[PDB]
Structure 1
Amino acid sequence: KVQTDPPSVPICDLYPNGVFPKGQECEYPEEKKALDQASEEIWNDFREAAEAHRQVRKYVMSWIKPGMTMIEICEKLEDCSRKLIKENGLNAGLAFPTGCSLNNCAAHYTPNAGDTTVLQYDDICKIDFGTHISGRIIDCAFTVTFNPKYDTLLKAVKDATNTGIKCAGIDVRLCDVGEAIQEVMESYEVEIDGKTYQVKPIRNLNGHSIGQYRIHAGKTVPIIKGGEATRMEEGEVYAIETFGSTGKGVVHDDMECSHYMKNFDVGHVPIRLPRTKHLLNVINENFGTLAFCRRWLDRLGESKYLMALKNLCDLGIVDPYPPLCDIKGSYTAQFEHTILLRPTCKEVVSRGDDY
């Protein structure tokens, strides 16, 4: 069987023998082959999630248009993602909420219930969403625009992200990747509405290592120089993402929060407060240590849960991730891919024919 025009066939049903397509395999900048084959089932899970990501985003690009509300966009994307990944509790599903951050806002924004925001012709929207199979997460993102005036800014960030991807590798120092990304990013100048700007990396936003059910495993991939000389290791998985801005090149928390995620290091915590106890149970059952958003709690039939959620945040059990924005009037863009540092090569597992 093949995929229907508007995708609806699970990726696992498109692949009979349970063997999924590899991403772009690259040479780094025998026994290791045996070691690589030993984790084949893991690489395969990443590939299944990546193929779902590729097919979902291809679909999104065909219909996303100004006039649609941000809620309509996210619900349409998420519905497709759930169907192609063949959602099954914590064994297969959405790794995190659909980011659709607009203009000066660079990341971590998704609408909460009631949000009336409508996508505009001049908007620059960062679609950042994730999929996973058995906790093997694909963190991948692109930027959507309708006005050609942002073309060079988008190209700047694409080139910067690919440079970071090419520089990445086993034994490579993280600070070197950041320095490389920055020199490419800043080599671009753009003109938007009569004003010129030297593209600037958003210095306090970074790429990161990825772990099972842990989007932010512990290591950071900076996008500017001056970072840590810590090195990348064999077997690690990384999200290489870069952000370019026409503003200050720095983001701050802004707007209402929609994203939340349980602190991975916090262990079991007995709670007697009834509503707070119930919410934590709902989170443990449906998300575990994966991120979620308010719309996802509404979907599960939960209501009047905001105070319970605040309690979990105040207790440090859950962490809030508010939208991150540059100054008013600035424009930000993002591109991101997930890479596997396999023993025999580097695989840009989420690479597509689109980006």
Structure 2
Amino acid sequence: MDTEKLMKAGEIAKKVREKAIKLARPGMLLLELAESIEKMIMELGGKPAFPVNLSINEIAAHYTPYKGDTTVLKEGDYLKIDVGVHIDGFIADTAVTVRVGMEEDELMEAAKEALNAAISVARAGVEIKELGKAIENEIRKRGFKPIVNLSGHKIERYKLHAGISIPNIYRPHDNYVLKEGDVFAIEPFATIGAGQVIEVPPTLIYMYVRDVPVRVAQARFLLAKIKREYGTLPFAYRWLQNDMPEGQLKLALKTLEKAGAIYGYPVLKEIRNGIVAQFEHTIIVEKDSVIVTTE
């Protein structure tokens, strides 16, 4: 339950994130970018907490390339790089928004500053809604809209989403009190849209949740793999594309999802297709202050 492991993951995450920004150049194939980042995490002695998310513009999050993905980077693209690393279950969840081949603009500044704002107020004994207020005001005061159905979350060993959120808006009932030992991921999301995300195809990220009886053999076999190799952490569709043909893989996945054996994470898009910016850091709450493990 190490602060070292948490910190180690934190520094690793940072390293691969900063590099990801330099590679995020126009003409860069999303697929290549992804496998470079993930490859860099292991070379550093870490493990992906989840497949690196690469979301462009209106696409808010939960997008990761796949084998055969032709999606390529171009100048002006508001690319959100959400990197996740874990050391023996100790996670580090961070992200940045880079507008390919250009500089940071207002929208991006809103999300970033929102983050900085939230972090500066984060202290043991402080109610989560305080962070929310801080975040919302940094985004709105800049004329943008926070995304209401996407927020930070408490993080625990081998558990990305611990069950306590940090909304990007102020809510009178978010009265949970930050305490020493708590690990949270603060990820303010800002957009020029309505400020709400929706589910849309395809489904490129999944996660094991429950071991349930499965009739079909191939599906049953896959479930066992997912469980054994990906445990209780999200995995990418891409990571399994070398296991079996496309047709069979999709069916298997589809079945397991149906049986309620695994969770499917469809790509999230702004409800008005408004460009979306996101900045995220992981923090550890201590007695006198918080520690941003990923800055």
Q: TM-score, normalised by structure 2?
A: 0.93
The alignment partner of 1:255 has SS state of strand
Question: Percent sequence identity over matched residues?
Answer: 37
- Out of 22, 40, 44, the position equivalent to 1:84 is 44
Q: Note the 1:169-318 alignment, pairs <5 A.
A: 169-188=123-142, 198-226=143-171, 227-263=173-209, 266=210, 268-299=211-242, 301-303=243-245, 304-318=248-262
Q: Distance in 2 between matches of 1:336 and 1:149?
A: 18
**Distance apart, 1:270 and its partner CA:** 4.1
- The one-letter amino acid paired with 1:231 is V
- Out of 51, 55, 58, the position equivalent to 2:11 is 51
Q: CA RMSD in A?
A: 1.7
Q: Which has the larger radius of gyration?
A: 1
- The one-letter amino acid paired with 1:243 is F
Check if 1:319 corresponds to 2:263: yes
1:176-221 superposed Cα distances (whole Å, 9 cap, x missing partner)? 2112210111111xxxxxxxxx211111110000111110011010
Aligned length: 292
Q: Distance in 2 between matches of 1:328 and 1:171?
A: 38
The alignment partner of 2:41 has SS state of helix
Q: Distance in 2 between matches of 1:116 and 1:151?
A: 27
Q: Distance in 2 between matches of 1:272 and 1:330?
A: 43
Check if 1:153 corresponds to 2:107: yes
**Distance apart, 1:69 and its partner CA:** 1.5
Q: Distance in 2 between matches of 1:82 and 1:296?
A: 15
1:18-70 superposed Cα distances (whole Å, 9 cap, x missing partner)? xxxxxxxxxxxxxxxxxxxxx5xx10001111121122122222222111121
Q: Distance in 1 between matches of 2:287 and 2:215?
A: 48
**Distance apart, 1:235 and its partner CA:** 1.3
Q: Distance in 1 between matches of 2:201 and 2:30?
A: 15
- The one-letter amino acid paired with 1:104 is E
**Distance apart, 1:171 and its partner CA:** 2.2
Query: Is the CA contact (8 Å cut-off) linking 2:212 and 2:259 kept in structure 1?
Result: no
1:138-184 superposed Cα distances (whole Å, 9 cap, x missing partner)? 00000111364751211111100111112222222122211221011
Aligned to 1:122: 76
Q: Distance in 2 between matches of 1:147 and 1:139?
A: 25
Aligned to 1:66: 26
Query: Is the CA contact (8 Å cut-off) linking 2:26 and 2:101 kept in structure 1?
Result: no
Query: Is the CA contact (8 Å cut-off) linking 2:14 and 2:94 kept in structure 1?
Result: no
Query: Is the CA contact (8 Å cut-off) linking 2:13 and 2:93 kept in structure 1?
Result: no
